[PDB]
Design a protein around this ligand. Structure first.
Ligand SMILES: *Cc1cc2c(cc1C)nc1c(=O)[nH]c(=O)nc-1n2C[C@H](O)[C@H](O)[C@H](O)COP(=O)(O)OP(=O)(O)OC[C@H]1O[C@@H](n2cnc3c(N)ncnc32)[C@H](O)[C@@H]1O
Ligand SMILES: *[C@@H]1O[C@H](CO)[C@@H](O[C@@H]2O[C@H](CO)[C@@H](O)[C@H](O)[C@H]2NC(C)=O)[C@H](O)[C@H]1NC(C)=O
Ligand SMILES: CC(C)=CCNc1ncnc2[nH]cnc12
Ligand SMILES: *[C@@H]1O[C@H](CO)[C@@H](O)[C@H](O)[C@H]1NC(C)=O
Ligand SMILES: *[C@@H]1O[C@H](CO)[C@@H](O)[C@H](O)[C@H]1NC(C)=O
Ligand SMILES: *[C@@H]1O[C@H](CO)[C@@H](O)[C@H](O)[C@H]1NC(C)=O
Length: 479
Protein backbone atom coordinates (compact mmCIF):
# COMPACT_ATOMS: atom_id res chain seq x y z
CA UNK A 1 0.00 0.00 0.00
CA UNK A 2 2.65 2.53 1.10
CA UNK A 3 5.51 0.90 -0.82
CA UNK A 4 3.67 1.07 -4.17
CA UNK A 5 3.21 4.80 -3.60
CA UNK A 6 7.01 4.85 -3.26
CA UNK A 7 6.81 5.69 0.44
CA UNK A 8 8.29 2.57 2.07
CA UNK A 9 11.80 2.17 0.69
CA UNK A 10 13.99 -0.94 1.08
CA UNK A 11 16.82 0.05 -1.28
CA UNK A 12 20.43 0.16 -0.08
CA UNK A 13 20.76 3.97 -0.29
CA UNK A 14 17.65 4.51 1.86
CA UNK A 15 18.62 1.97 4.53
CA UNK A 16 22.25 3.15 4.63
CA UNK A 17 21.24 6.80 5.19
CA UNK A 18 19.06 5.79 8.16
CA UNK A 19 21.78 3.56 9.67
CA UNK A 20 24.20 6.18 11.06
CA UNK A 21 23.89 9.24 13.29
CA UNK A 22 25.77 12.33 14.53
CA UNK A 23 27.56 10.21 17.14
CA UNK A 24 29.31 8.36 14.29
CA UNK A 25 30.11 5.54 16.73
CA UNK A 26 27.31 3.00 16.36
CA UNK A 27 25.40 1.87 13.27
CA UNK A 28 22.37 -0.33 12.61
CA UNK A 29 20.70 -1.05 9.30
CA UNK A 30 16.90 -0.88 9.20
CA UNK A 31 14.85 -3.23 7.01
CA UNK A 32 13.00 -0.23 5.51
CA UNK A 33 12.60 3.55 5.64
CA UNK A 34 9.23 5.31 5.45
CA UNK A 35 9.10 8.67 3.65
CA UNK A 36 5.65 9.89 4.75
CA UNK A 37 4.04 12.61 2.63
CA UNK A 38 1.41 13.24 5.31
CA UNK A 39 0.54 12.24 8.91
CA UNK A 40 -1.96 9.87 7.27
CA UNK A 41 1.00 7.75 6.17
CA UNK A 42 2.23 7.51 9.76
CA UNK A 43 -1.24 6.59 11.01
CA UNK A 44 -1.27 3.87 8.32
CA UNK A 45 2.07 2.39 9.45
CA UNK A 46 1.28 2.47 13.18
CA UNK A 47 -2.25 1.16 12.63
CA UNK A 48 -0.85 -1.74 10.59
CA UNK A 49 1.74 -2.42 13.31
CA UNK A 50 -1.00 -2.35 15.94
CA UNK A 51 -3.50 -4.62 14.17
CA UNK A 52 -1.14 -7.20 12.61
CA UNK A 53 -0.35 -10.35 14.62
CA UNK A 54 3.29 -11.24 14.08
CA UNK A 55 4.16 -7.65 13.12
CA UNK A 56 7.92 -7.89 12.47
CA UNK A 57 9.22 -4.35 12.80
CA UNK A 58 10.30 -1.95 15.49
CA UNK A 59 9.75 1.67 14.44
CA UNK A 60 12.00 4.68 15.01
CA UNK A 61 11.37 8.33 14.18
CA UNK A 62 14.44 9.94 12.63
CA UNK A 63 14.40 13.69 13.24
CA UNK A 64 17.75 14.78 11.84
CA UNK A 65 19.64 11.87 13.43
CA UNK A 66 21.44 14.06 15.93
CA UNK A 67 21.46 11.14 18.40
CA UNK A 68 24.84 10.09 19.79
CA UNK A 69 24.43 6.34 20.30
CA UNK A 70 21.82 4.95 17.93
CA UNK A 71 18.65 6.25 19.59
CA UNK A 72 17.09 6.91 16.18
CA UNK A 73 17.89 3.46 14.71
CA UNK A 74 15.46 0.63 14.07
CA UNK A 75 17.71 -2.45 13.70
CA UNK A 76 15.98 -4.71 11.20
CA UNK A 77 12.94 -2.46 11.53
CA UNK A 78 11.39 0.66 9.99
CA UNK A 79 12.93 4.12 10.33
CA UNK A 80 10.53 6.99 9.64
CA UNK A 81 12.25 9.76 7.70
CA UNK A 82 10.28 12.48 9.52
CA UNK A 83 11.70 15.26 7.30
CA UNK A 84 9.45 13.97 4.47
CA UNK A 85 6.41 15.48 6.22
CA UNK A 86 7.78 18.94 5.40
CA UNK A 87 8.48 18.32 1.71
CA UNK A 88 5.21 19.81 0.37
CA UNK A 89 4.98 23.59 -0.15
CA UNK A 90 1.43 23.65 1.24
CA UNK A 91 -0.04 23.42 3.71
CA UNK A 92 2.59 25.06 5.97
CA UNK A 93 4.21 22.97 8.71
CA UNK A 94 4.75 26.01 10.95
CA UNK A 95 1.83 28.27 11.95
CA UNK A 96 2.26 31.24 14.23
CA UNK A 97 -1.09 31.76 16.00
CA UNK A 98 -3.40 34.57 14.97
CA UNK A 99 -2.62 36.46 18.20
CA UNK A 100 1.10 35.58 18.12
CA UNK A 101 1.06 33.86 21.54
CA UNK A 102 2.15 30.44 20.25
CA UNK A 103 3.54 28.64 17.21
CA UNK A 104 2.33 25.28 15.88
CA UNK A 105 5.23 23.31 14.43
CA UNK A 106 5.36 19.90 12.76
CA UNK A 107 7.34 17.34 14.76
CA UNK A 108 9.77 17.01 11.86
CA UNK A 109 10.46 20.75 11.65
CA UNK A 110 13.88 22.07 12.69
CA UNK A 111 14.05 24.81 15.33
CA UNK A 112 15.93 27.17 12.97
CA UNK A 113 12.84 27.19 10.74
CA UNK A 114 10.55 27.67 13.75
CA UNK A 115 12.70 30.68 14.63
CA UNK A 116 12.44 32.20 11.14
CA UNK A 117 8.67 31.71 10.90
CA UNK A 118 8.20 33.17 14.38
CA UNK A 119 10.39 36.25 13.72
CA UNK A 120 8.31 37.01 10.60
CA UNK A 121 5.45 37.58 13.06
CA UNK A 122 7.57 39.52 15.58
CA UNK A 123 7.73 36.64 18.07
CA UNK A 124 10.04 33.78 19.11
CA UNK A 125 10.15 30.70 21.38
CA UNK A 126 11.48 31.42 24.90
CA UNK A 127 13.56 28.28 25.47
CA UNK A 128 16.20 26.99 23.07
CA UNK A 129 18.91 24.46 22.39
CA UNK A 130 22.47 25.65 21.70
CA UNK A 131 22.22 24.29 18.16
CA UNK A 132 19.16 24.93 16.03
CA UNK A 133 19.29 22.20 13.36
CA UNK A 134 17.35 19.77 15.57
CA UNK A 135 13.71 18.75 15.26
CA UNK A 136 10.84 19.85 17.44
CA UNK A 137 9.89 16.21 18.07
CA UNK A 138 13.49 15.20 18.76
CA UNK A 139 14.30 17.81 21.40
CA UNK A 140 10.88 17.43 23.04
CA UNK A 141 11.51 13.68 23.31
CA UNK A 142 14.59 14.56 25.40
CA UNK A 143 14.14 17.91 27.20
CA UNK A 144 15.74 20.67 25.13
CA UNK A 145 18.19 22.73 27.19
CA UNK A 146 20.18 25.92 26.72
CA UNK A 147 21.04 29.07 28.65
CA UNK A 148 17.37 30.18 28.91
CA UNK A 149 16.25 27.04 30.74
CA UNK A 150 17.13 28.38 34.21
CA UNK A 151 14.32 30.93 33.91
CA UNK A 152 11.89 29.43 31.37
CA UNK A 153 12.48 25.73 31.89
CA UNK A 154 13.59 23.34 29.15
CA UNK A 155 11.65 23.14 25.88
CA UNK A 156 9.38 20.46 27.39
CA UNK A 157 8.17 23.11 29.90
CA UNK A 158 7.15 25.39 27.01
CA UNK A 159 4.69 23.16 25.16
CA UNK A 160 0.95 23.88 25.30
CA UNK A 161 -0.26 20.77 23.47
CA UNK A 162 0.74 18.14 20.94
CA UNK A 163 -0.67 15.80 18.33
CA UNK A 164 0.73 12.33 18.92
CA UNK A 165 0.13 9.09 17.05
CA UNK A 166 0.56 6.28 19.59
CA UNK A 167 1.85 2.74 19.17
CA UNK A 168 -1.80 1.74 18.79
CA UNK A 169 -1.90 3.91 15.65
CA UNK A 170 -4.36 6.37 17.18
CA UNK A 171 -4.00 10.10 16.54
CA UNK A 172 -4.38 11.85 19.90
CA UNK A 173 -4.34 15.54 20.83
CA UNK A 174 -2.88 15.91 24.33
CA UNK A 175 -2.24 18.68 26.86
CA UNK A 176 -2.53 19.28 30.60
CA UNK A 177 -6.31 19.49 30.03
CA UNK A 178 -6.76 16.47 27.74
CA UNK A 179 -5.00 13.09 27.69
CA UNK A 180 -2.48 14.57 30.17
CA UNK A 181 -1.03 11.11 30.86
CA UNK A 182 0.18 10.84 27.24
CA UNK A 183 1.26 14.51 27.24
CA UNK A 184 3.47 14.01 30.31
CA UNK A 185 4.78 10.64 29.08
CA UNK A 186 5.82 11.86 25.62
CA UNK A 187 7.68 14.92 26.96
CA UNK A 188 11.19 13.65 27.66
CA UNK A 189 9.74 10.25 26.78
CA UNK A 190 12.54 9.19 24.42
CA UNK A 191 10.17 8.31 21.56
CA UNK A 192 8.73 5.37 23.51
CA UNK A 193 5.00 6.15 23.42
CA UNK A 194 4.23 7.66 20.05
CA UNK A 195 5.30 10.14 17.40
CA UNK A 196 4.82 13.90 17.90
CA UNK A 197 3.43 15.18 14.59
CA UNK A 198 2.69 18.68 15.90
CA UNK A 199 3.71 20.63 18.98
CA UNK A 200 2.26 23.92 20.21
CA UNK A 201 5.22 26.03 21.38
CA UNK A 202 5.03 29.08 23.67
CA UNK A 203 6.41 32.30 22.20
CA UNK A 204 7.30 35.79 23.49
CA UNK A 205 7.68 39.14 21.69
CA UNK A 206 11.01 38.80 19.86
CA UNK A 207 13.93 40.84 21.21
CA UNK A 208 15.87 42.64 18.48
CA UNK A 209 19.37 42.33 19.87
CA UNK A 210 21.52 40.62 22.48
CA UNK A 211 24.36 42.11 24.48
CA UNK A 212 26.61 39.09 24.73
CA UNK A 213 29.33 38.73 27.36
CA UNK A 214 32.03 36.28 28.41
CA UNK A 215 33.56 36.58 31.91
CA UNK A 216 36.77 34.85 32.88
CA UNK A 217 37.64 33.09 36.16
CA UNK A 218 40.52 30.98 37.46
CA UNK A 219 38.57 30.12 40.61
CA UNK A 220 35.81 27.50 40.23
CA UNK A 221 34.07 28.52 43.47
CA UNK A 222 33.75 32.13 42.27
CA UNK A 223 32.73 30.98 38.77
CA UNK A 224 29.98 28.65 40.05
CA UNK A 225 28.75 31.03 42.78
CA UNK A 226 28.35 33.76 40.16
CA UNK A 227 26.46 31.45 37.78
CA UNK A 228 24.13 30.59 40.68
CA UNK A 229 23.71 34.30 41.51
CA UNK A 230 22.81 35.16 37.91
CA UNK A 231 20.25 32.34 37.71
CA UNK A 232 18.72 32.60 41.20
CA UNK A 233 15.00 33.31 41.65
CA UNK A 234 14.25 36.85 42.90
CA UNK A 235 10.86 35.97 38.89
CA UNK A 236 14.48 36.13 37.76
CA UNK A 237 17.38 38.58 37.35
CA UNK A 238 18.09 40.56 34.16
CA UNK A 239 20.15 37.99 32.21
CA UNK A 240 18.34 36.26 29.35
CA UNK A 241 20.86 33.42 28.99
CA UNK A 242 23.53 31.96 31.26
CA UNK A 243 25.99 29.23 30.33
CA UNK A 244 29.62 28.52 31.15
CA UNK A 245 32.65 26.71 29.77
CA UNK A 246 35.76 25.01 31.12
CA UNK A 247 39.25 25.26 29.59
CA UNK A 248 42.00 22.83 30.60
CA UNK A 249 45.58 24.11 30.68
CA UNK A 250 47.05 21.81 28.00
CA UNK A 251 44.68 23.02 25.26
CA UNK A 252 43.95 26.46 26.73
CA UNK A 253 44.86 28.75 23.80
CA UNK A 254 43.33 26.36 21.25
CA UNK A 255 40.06 25.85 23.14
CA UNK A 256 39.67 29.58 23.85
CA UNK A 257 40.15 30.35 20.15
CA UNK A 258 37.64 27.60 19.28
CA UNK A 259 34.80 29.39 21.13
CA UNK A 260 34.53 31.75 18.17
CA UNK A 261 34.06 34.55 20.71
CA UNK A 262 37.60 35.56 21.68
CA UNK A 263 39.97 37.29 19.28
CA UNK A 264 43.62 36.19 19.18
CA UNK A 265 44.51 39.19 21.38
CA UNK A 266 41.74 38.19 23.83
CA UNK A 267 43.13 34.64 23.97
CA UNK A 268 46.67 35.95 24.58
CA UNK A 269 45.45 38.02 27.55
CA UNK A 270 43.66 35.02 29.10
CA UNK A 271 46.65 32.72 28.52
CA UNK A 272 48.85 35.34 30.24
CA UNK A 273 46.41 35.53 33.18
CA UNK A 274 46.36 31.74 33.67
CA UNK A 275 50.17 31.80 33.56
CA UNK A 276 50.68 34.45 36.25
CA UNK A 277 48.24 32.51 38.47
CA UNK A 278 49.63 29.06 37.55
CA UNK A 279 46.04 28.01 36.83
CA UNK A 280 45.43 24.48 35.53
CA UNK A 281 41.83 25.36 34.60
CA UNK A 282 40.14 28.52 33.30
CA UNK A 283 36.38 29.11 33.46
CA UNK A 284 34.13 31.45 31.51
CA UNK A 285 30.56 32.52 32.13
CA UNK A 286 28.67 33.23 28.92
CA UNK A 287 25.64 35.46 29.36
CA UNK A 288 23.32 37.67 27.37
CA UNK A 289 20.92 40.54 27.93
CA UNK A 290 18.18 40.74 25.30
CA UNK A 291 16.84 44.18 24.37
CA UNK A 292 23.10 53.53 26.95
CA UNK A 293 20.35 51.95 29.04
CA UNK A 294 21.84 48.54 28.22
CA UNK A 295 25.28 49.83 29.27
CA UNK A 296 24.05 50.77 32.76
CA UNK A 297 21.90 47.65 33.17
CA UNK A 298 24.87 45.44 32.24
CA UNK A 299 27.23 47.42 34.48
CA UNK A 300 24.82 46.95 37.41
CA UNK A 301 24.64 43.15 36.99
CA UNK A 302 28.40 42.79 36.41
CA UNK A 303 28.97 44.76 39.60
CA UNK A 304 27.41 41.88 41.58
CA UNK A 305 29.96 39.43 40.15
CA UNK A 306 33.55 38.42 40.97
CA UNK A 307 35.19 37.63 37.61
CA UNK A 308 38.79 38.77 37.12
CA UNK A 309 38.82 42.52 36.56
CA UNK A 310 39.80 43.29 32.97
CA UNK A 311 38.26 40.03 31.81
CA UNK A 312 34.76 40.91 30.68
CA UNK A 313 34.48 40.54 26.91
CA UNK A 314 31.49 41.98 25.04
CA UNK A 315 29.77 41.44 21.72
CA UNK A 316 26.52 43.05 20.51
CA UNK A 317 24.54 41.13 17.90
CA UNK A 318 21.11 40.65 16.38
CA UNK A 319 19.06 38.20 18.49
CA UNK A 320 18.76 35.70 15.61
CA UNK A 321 22.51 35.79 15.01
CA UNK A 322 23.13 34.91 18.66
CA UNK A 323 20.64 32.02 18.58
CA UNK A 324 22.11 30.53 15.40
CA UNK A 325 25.75 31.00 16.53
CA UNK A 326 26.63 27.29 16.36
CA UNK A 327 25.61 27.02 12.69
CA UNK A 328 28.64 29.14 11.78
CA UNK A 329 30.78 26.87 13.97
CA UNK A 330 29.56 23.79 12.07
CA UNK A 331 30.27 25.42 8.68
CA UNK A 332 33.84 26.32 9.72
CA UNK A 333 34.57 22.91 11.29
CA UNK A 334 33.02 21.06 8.32
CA UNK A 335 35.31 22.90 5.87
CA UNK A 336 38.26 21.46 7.80
CA UNK A 337 36.66 18.00 7.99
CA UNK A 338 36.30 18.35 11.75
CA UNK A 339 32.51 18.21 12.11
CA UNK A 340 31.59 14.75 10.76
CA UNK A 341 33.85 12.87 13.20
CA UNK A 342 33.01 10.50 16.11
CA UNK A 343 31.40 12.38 18.99
CA UNK A 344 31.86 10.51 22.29
CA UNK A 345 29.89 13.20 24.11
CA UNK A 346 29.25 12.98 27.83
CA UNK A 347 26.13 14.80 29.03
CA UNK A 348 24.72 14.75 32.55
CA UNK A 349 22.91 16.71 35.23
CA UNK A 350 25.02 17.09 38.38
CA UNK A 351 23.44 18.18 41.70
CA UNK A 352 24.70 21.54 42.99
CA UNK A 353 25.91 20.05 46.30
CA UNK A 354 28.50 18.01 44.38
CA UNK A 355 29.54 20.31 41.52
CA UNK A 356 32.75 21.41 43.29
CA UNK A 357 33.63 17.72 43.80
CA UNK A 358 32.94 17.08 40.10
CA UNK A 359 35.24 19.99 39.23
CA UNK A 360 37.98 18.54 41.46
CA UNK A 361 37.71 15.02 40.01
CA UNK A 362 37.08 15.82 36.35
CA UNK A 363 38.26 19.29 35.29
CA UNK A 364 41.17 19.50 37.74
CA UNK A 365 41.72 15.73 37.65
CA UNK A 366 40.83 13.30 34.84
CA UNK A 367 40.85 15.79 31.95
CA UNK A 368 44.20 17.38 32.89
CA UNK A 369 47.12 16.72 30.54
CA UNK A 370 44.95 15.91 27.51
CA UNK A 371 44.36 17.69 24.21
CA UNK A 372 40.68 18.64 24.39
CA UNK A 373 38.75 19.40 21.21
CA UNK A 374 35.13 20.44 21.65
CA UNK A 375 33.45 22.64 24.27
CA UNK A 376 33.14 21.66 27.92
CA UNK A 377 29.88 23.31 28.97
CA UNK A 378 28.74 23.75 32.58
CA UNK A 379 25.81 25.80 33.89
CA UNK A 380 23.16 25.68 36.64
CA UNK A 381 19.47 24.90 36.14
CA UNK A 382 16.48 25.48 38.41
CA UNK A 383 14.41 22.36 39.19
CA UNK A 384 11.38 24.61 39.86
CA UNK A 385 11.10 25.16 36.10
CA UNK A 386 10.95 21.42 35.37
CA UNK A 387 7.80 19.29 35.59
CA UNK A 388 8.72 16.05 37.42
CA UNK A 389 5.48 14.47 36.17
CA UNK A 390 7.02 14.43 32.69
CA UNK A 391 9.29 11.55 31.63
CA UNK A 392 12.56 13.53 31.76
CA UNK A 393 14.68 12.62 34.80
CA UNK A 394 16.56 15.22 36.84
CA UNK A 395 18.53 15.25 40.12
CA UNK A 396 16.56 15.81 43.34
CA UNK A 397 18.18 19.13 44.33
CA UNK A 398 16.62 22.58 43.67
CA UNK A 399 19.68 23.47 41.61
CA UNK A 400 21.61 21.09 39.36
CA UNK A 401 24.16 21.70 36.61
CA UNK A 402 24.04 20.78 32.96
CA UNK A 403 27.47 19.30 32.27
CA UNK A 404 28.09 18.71 28.57
CA UNK A 405 31.55 17.48 27.64
CA UNK A 406 31.49 17.60 23.86
CA UNK A 407 34.56 15.59 22.88
CA UNK A 408 35.43 15.24 19.21
CA UNK A 409 37.65 12.28 18.32
CA UNK A 410 43.37 5.94 18.38
CA UNK A 411 41.54 8.85 19.98
CA UNK A 412 38.07 7.25 20.11
CA UNK A 413 38.97 4.32 22.39
CA UNK A 414 40.88 6.73 24.67
CA UNK A 415 37.90 9.10 24.89
CA UNK A 416 35.48 6.21 25.50
CA UNK A 417 37.72 4.95 28.30
CA UNK A 418 37.96 8.51 29.69
CA UNK A 419 34.14 8.79 29.79
CA UNK A 420 33.88 5.46 31.64
CA UNK A 421 36.50 6.79 34.08
CA UNK A 422 34.51 10.01 34.67
CA UNK A 423 31.35 7.99 35.38
CA UNK A 424 33.36 5.65 37.63
CA UNK A 425 34.62 8.68 39.59
CA UNK A 426 31.06 9.99 40.01
CA UNK A 427 29.70 6.61 41.16
CA UNK A 428 32.51 6.10 43.67
CA UNK A 429 32.02 9.64 44.97
CA UNK A 430 28.31 8.88 45.34
CA UNK A 431 27.29 11.80 43.12
CA UNK A 432 23.59 11.40 42.30
CA UNK A 433 23.80 12.52 38.65
CA UNK A 434 21.30 11.87 35.85
CA UNK A 435 22.53 11.22 32.32
CA UNK A 436 21.04 13.26 29.48
CA UNK A 437 21.10 12.21 25.78
CA UNK A 438 22.61 8.85 26.72
CA UNK A 439 21.07 5.44 26.25
CA UNK A 440 21.61 2.70 28.83
CA UNK A 441 21.92 -0.98 27.94
CA UNK A 442 20.39 -2.93 30.83
CA UNK A 443 17.24 -2.80 32.96
CA UNK A 444 18.95 -1.84 36.23
CA UNK A 445 20.69 1.20 34.71
CA UNK A 446 17.41 2.49 33.25
CA UNK A 447 15.54 1.90 36.51
CA UNK A 448 18.26 3.88 38.34
CA UNK A 449 17.99 6.64 35.72
CA UNK A 450 14.27 7.17 36.34
CA UNK A 451 14.08 6.10 39.98
CA UNK A 452 11.55 3.50 41.15
CA UNK A 453 8.41 5.67 41.10
CA UNK A 454 9.01 7.31 37.72
CA UNK A 455 10.12 3.98 36.23
CA UNK A 456 6.88 2.30 37.26
CA UNK A 457 4.94 5.18 35.68
CA UNK A 458 7.11 4.87 32.54
CA UNK A 459 6.21 1.16 32.30
CA UNK A 460 2.50 1.86 32.85
CA UNK A 461 2.57 4.34 29.98
CA UNK A 462 4.50 1.88 27.81
CA UNK A 463 1.85 -0.82 28.36
CA UNK A 464 -0.88 1.71 27.55
CA UNK A 465 0.67 3.31 24.48
CA UNK A 466 3.21 0.87 23.00
CA UNK A 467 2.35 -2.63 24.34
CA UNK A 468 4.22 -4.40 21.50
CA UNK A 469 7.41 -2.48 22.44
CA UNK A 470 8.01 -1.31 18.87
CA UNK A 471 8.83 2.35 19.30
CA UNK A 472 12.32 3.90 19.34
CA UNK A 473 14.11 0.61 20.15
CA UNK A 474 17.52 2.31 19.97
CA UNK A 475 16.94 3.71 23.47
CA UNK A 476 17.42 0.11 24.66
CA UNK A 477 14.83 0.52 27.45
CA UNK A 478 12.33 -2.10 26.29
CA UNK A 479 14.51 -3.48 23.48
C1 LIG B 1 23.80 17.01 17.05
C2 LIG B 1 23.70 17.91 18.27
C3 LIG B 1 22.70 17.65 19.22
C4 LIG B 1 22.39 18.59 20.21
C5 LIG B 1 23.07 19.82 20.24
C6 LIG B 1 24.07 20.08 19.31
C7 LIG B 1 24.38 19.14 18.32
C8 LIG B 1 25.40 19.55 17.29
N1 LIG B 1 22.76 20.77 21.20
C9 LIG B 1 21.77 20.52 22.14
C10 LIG B 1 21.44 21.46 23.12
O1 LIG B 1 22.06 22.52 23.22
N2 LIG B 1 20.45 21.17 24.04
C11 LIG B 1 19.78 19.95 23.99
O2 LIG B 1 18.88 19.70 24.79
N3 LIG B 1 20.11 19.03 23.03
C12 LIG B 1 21.10 19.29 22.11
N4 LIG B 1 21.41 18.34 21.15
C13 LIG B 1 20.91 16.93 21.37
C14 LIG B 1 19.55 16.76 20.68
O3 LIG B 1 18.52 17.35 21.46
C15 LIG B 1 19.28 15.27 20.44
O4 LIG B 1 20.17 14.83 19.44
C16 LIG B 1 17.83 14.96 20.05
O5 LIG B 1 17.72 13.58 19.75
C17 LIG B 1 17.27 15.80 18.89
O6 LIG B 1 17.88 15.45 17.67
P1 LIG B 1 16.97 14.99 16.41
O7 LIG B 1 15.88 15.96 16.20
O8 LIG B 1 17.88 14.80 15.20
O9 LIG B 1 16.25 13.61 16.86
P2 LIG B 1 16.84 12.14 16.51
O10 LIG B 1 18.23 12.03 16.99
O11 LIG B 1 16.70 11.79 15.03
O12 LIG B 1 15.83 11.28 17.40
C18 LIG B 1 16.03 11.21 18.80
C19 LIG B 1 15.04 10.26 19.47
O13 LIG B 1 13.75 10.85 19.49
C20 LIG B 1 12.83 10.10 18.72
N5 LIG B 1 12.06 11.05 17.90
C21 LIG B 1 12.51 11.89 16.91
N6 LIG B 1 11.46 12.62 16.44
C22 LIG B 1 10.36 12.28 17.15
C23 LIG B 1 9.03 12.70 17.11
N7 LIG B 1 8.59 13.54 16.16
N8 LIG B 1 8.13 12.14 17.97
C24 LIG B 1 8.51 11.17 18.89
N9 LIG B 1 9.82 10.76 18.91
C25 LIG B 1 10.73 11.30 18.06
C26 LIG B 1 13.66 9.12 17.90
O14 LIG B 1 12.96 7.93 17.63
C27 LIG B 1 14.90 8.93 18.75
O15 LIG B 1 14.67 7.93 19.73
C1 LIG C 1 -0.99 25.20 9.47
O1 LIG C 1 -2.30 25.69 9.20
C2 LIG C 1 -2.93 25.11 8.06
C3 LIG C 1 -4.30 25.76 7.91
O2 LIG C 1 -4.16 26.87 7.05
C4 LIG C 1 -3.04 23.58 8.14
O3 LIG C 1 -3.35 23.10 6.85
C5 LIG C 1 -4.42 22.13 6.86
O4 LIG C 1 -3.96 20.84 7.25
C6 LIG C 1 -4.92 19.80 7.20
C7 LIG C 1 -4.31 18.50 7.72
O5 LIG C 1 -3.07 18.74 8.36
C8 LIG C 1 -5.45 19.64 5.77
O6 LIG C 1 -6.46 18.66 5.72
C9 LIG C 1 -6.01 20.97 5.25
O7 LIG C 1 -6.31 20.84 3.88
C10 LIG C 1 -5.02 22.11 5.45
N1 LIG C 1 -5.65 23.39 5.16
C11 LIG C 1 -5.14 24.30 4.33
C12 LIG C 1 -5.82 25.64 4.33
O8 LIG C 1 -4.19 24.10 3.58
C13 LIG C 1 -1.72 22.94 8.60
O9 LIG C 1 -1.94 21.60 8.99
C14 LIG C 1 -1.12 23.70 9.78
N2 LIG C 1 0.14 23.08 10.15
C15 LIG C 1 0.34 22.59 11.37
C16 LIG C 1 1.59 21.78 11.58
O10 LIG C 1 -0.42 22.77 12.31
C1 LIG D 1 23.23 19.55 25.47
C2 LIG D 1 24.15 19.68 24.30
C3 LIG D 1 24.51 18.45 23.51
C4 LIG D 1 24.66 20.89 23.96
C5 LIG D 1 25.58 21.02 22.78
N1 LIG D 1 26.01 22.38 22.53
C6 LIG D 1 26.88 22.58 21.51
N2 LIG D 1 27.19 21.61 20.59
C7 LIG D 1 28.10 21.84 19.63
N3 LIG D 1 28.75 23.02 19.54
C8 LIG D 1 28.49 24.00 20.44
N4 LIG D 1 29.07 25.25 20.46
C9 LIG D 1 28.46 25.83 21.55
N5 LIG D 1 27.54 25.02 22.18
C10 LIG D 1 27.60 23.86 21.43
C1 LIG E 1 31.53 7.57 10.72
O1 LIG E 1 31.78 8.43 9.62
C2 LIG E 1 32.73 7.91 8.70
C3 LIG E 1 33.09 8.98 7.67
O2 LIG E 1 34.13 9.78 8.19
C4 LIG E 1 32.21 6.62 8.05
O3 LIG E 1 33.17 6.08 7.17
C5 LIG E 1 31.88 5.61 9.15
O4 LIG E 1 31.27 4.46 8.59
C6 LIG E 1 30.98 6.23 10.22
N1 LIG E 1 30.81 5.31 11.33
C7 LIG E 1 29.64 5.10 11.93
C8 LIG E 1 29.61 4.00 12.95
O5 LIG E 1 28.63 5.75 11.69
C1 LIG F 1 -5.32 -1.83 17.26
O1 LIG F 1 -5.46 -3.24 17.19
C2 LIG F 1 -6.63 -3.78 17.78
C3 LIG F 1 -6.62 -5.29 17.55
O2 LIG F 1 -5.97 -5.94 18.62
C4 LIG F 1 -7.90 -3.16 17.17
O3 LIG F 1 -9.03 -3.50 17.95
C5 LIG F 1 -7.82 -1.64 17.05
O4 LIG F 1 -8.86 -1.21 16.20
C6 LIG F 1 -6.48 -1.20 16.47
N1 LIG F 1 -6.38 0.26 16.40
C7 LIG F 1 -5.94 0.88 15.30
C8 LIG F 1 -6.14 2.37 15.25
O5 LIG F 1 -5.39 0.29 14.37
C1 LIG G 1 50.08 24.50 30.95
O1 LIG G 1 50.46 23.58 29.95
C2 LIG G 1 51.74 23.79 29.37
C3 LIG G 1 52.00 22.67 28.37
O2 LIG G 1 51.04 22.69 27.34
C4 LIG G 1 52.86 23.83 30.43
O3 LIG G 1 54.03 24.37 29.86
C5 LIG G 1 52.49 24.66 31.66
O4 LIG G 1 53.39 24.37 32.71
C6 LIG G 1 51.06 24.40 32.13
N1 LIG G 1 50.70 25.33 33.19
C7 LIG G 1 50.36 24.95 34.43
C8 LIG G 1 50.48 26.01 35.49
O5 LIG G 1 49.96 23.83 34.73
Amino acid sequence: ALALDGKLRTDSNATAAASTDFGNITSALPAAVLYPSSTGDLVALLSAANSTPGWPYTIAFRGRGHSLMGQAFAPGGVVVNMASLGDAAAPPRINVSADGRYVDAGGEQVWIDVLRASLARGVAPRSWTDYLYLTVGGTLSNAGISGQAFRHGPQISNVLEMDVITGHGEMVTCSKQLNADLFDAVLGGLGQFGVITRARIAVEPAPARARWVRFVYTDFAAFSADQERLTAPRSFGPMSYVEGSVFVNQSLATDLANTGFFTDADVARIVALAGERNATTVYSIEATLNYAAVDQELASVLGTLSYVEGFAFQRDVAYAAFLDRVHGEEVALNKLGLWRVPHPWLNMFVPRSRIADFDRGVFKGILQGTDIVGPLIVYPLNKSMWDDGMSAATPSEDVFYAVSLLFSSNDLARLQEQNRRILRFCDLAGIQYKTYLARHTDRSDWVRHFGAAKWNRFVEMKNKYDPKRLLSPGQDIFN
